[PDB]
Amino acid sequence: DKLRKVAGEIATKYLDPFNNVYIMAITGARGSELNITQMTALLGQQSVRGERIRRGYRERTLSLFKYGDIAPEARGFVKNSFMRGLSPYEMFFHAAGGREGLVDTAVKTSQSGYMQRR
């Protein structure tokens, strides 16, 4: 997390003082600092259900890595921004991280409706 924050700060510092994306972000017009970091510096750690990507083979989140590997790159850490492009396993980990919202919104709608009716 500290690595991602530092990389985002570096990218912002080396970035142009007044860009259209920067103007959108700073003015509050459909932007955020995290979006700038992920589009420019790096994606960062991709966590599913609040933890690193663990699902997969035994002691491996993916068959591309060695047995019992706990290196950051192995378990859902992406060092590549969207401008640079994601590696295949990095893209797989990003998809695994982003899978949750697709169902969380659907369950949240019904639960909120039921509670509000009550």
Binding site: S63, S87, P88, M91, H94
Partner: protein, 196 residues
């Protein structure tokens, strides 16, 4: 050389033998059913894999060796319904498919089926891929590696391969594209006029 479970039990009971001799042996399962015991799982798994690659055994047989510190087993699967994918076999850090094979493919002398029959490329299931070590690219290949990927971007489907530069997008964007690309208008068939 797999010794049946009933034979093993008989030769421990009917004949006086060391139980610890057979405790260190590797269990051998077939389609989830305990088939027997073997000296070592790795050797039997390698024998089955080589027999399948040489064409003696059927290509639908997938063998895996667990070798957990607590327990070691050999799992052999030949049932239907297993989702299996093809990988280039890599031996001693060099893939079995060579320049001559690629030249023949480009000329058209041999096809993908000829490649898999020759033993260069093999289809593996999840259980067999448990003990496989794969490399995305030939420059990532090491002698420790066991397999190579035919196409690094083949992890996608029919629609996810429609997107240009999909690795620069966010995953929800690609998912929504896949969802809404089925609704797009176009020519669904060349014979749409006669069809009803």
């Amino acid at each position: 050389g797999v010794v049946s479970v009933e034979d093993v039990i008989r030769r421990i009971s009917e004949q006086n033998e060391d139980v610890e001799k057979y405790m260190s042996w590797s269990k051998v399962y077939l389609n989830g059913r305990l088939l027997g015991y073997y000296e070592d799982g790795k050797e039997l798994a390698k024998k089955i894999r080589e027999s399948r690659r040489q064409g003696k055994l059927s290509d639908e047989v997938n063998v895996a060796y667990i070798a957990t510190d607590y327990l070691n087993e050999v799992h052999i699967n030949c049932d239907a319904g297993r989702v299996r994918r093809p990988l280039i076999i890599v031996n001693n850090g060099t893939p079995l498919v060579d320049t001559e094979d690629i030249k023949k493919l480009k000329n058209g002398e041999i096809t993908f089926d000829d490649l898999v029959k020759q033993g260069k490329i093999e289809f593996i299931d999840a259980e067999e891929e448990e003990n496989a070590y794969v490399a995305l690219n030939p420059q990532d290949l090491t002698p420790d590696h066991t397999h190579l990927e035919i196409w690094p971007s083949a992890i996608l489907g029919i629609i996810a391969s429609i997107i240009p530069y999909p690795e620069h997008n966010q995953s929800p964007r690609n998912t929504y594209q896949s969802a809404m690309a089925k609704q797009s208008l176009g020519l669904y068939a060349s014979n749409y006029q006669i069809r009803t």
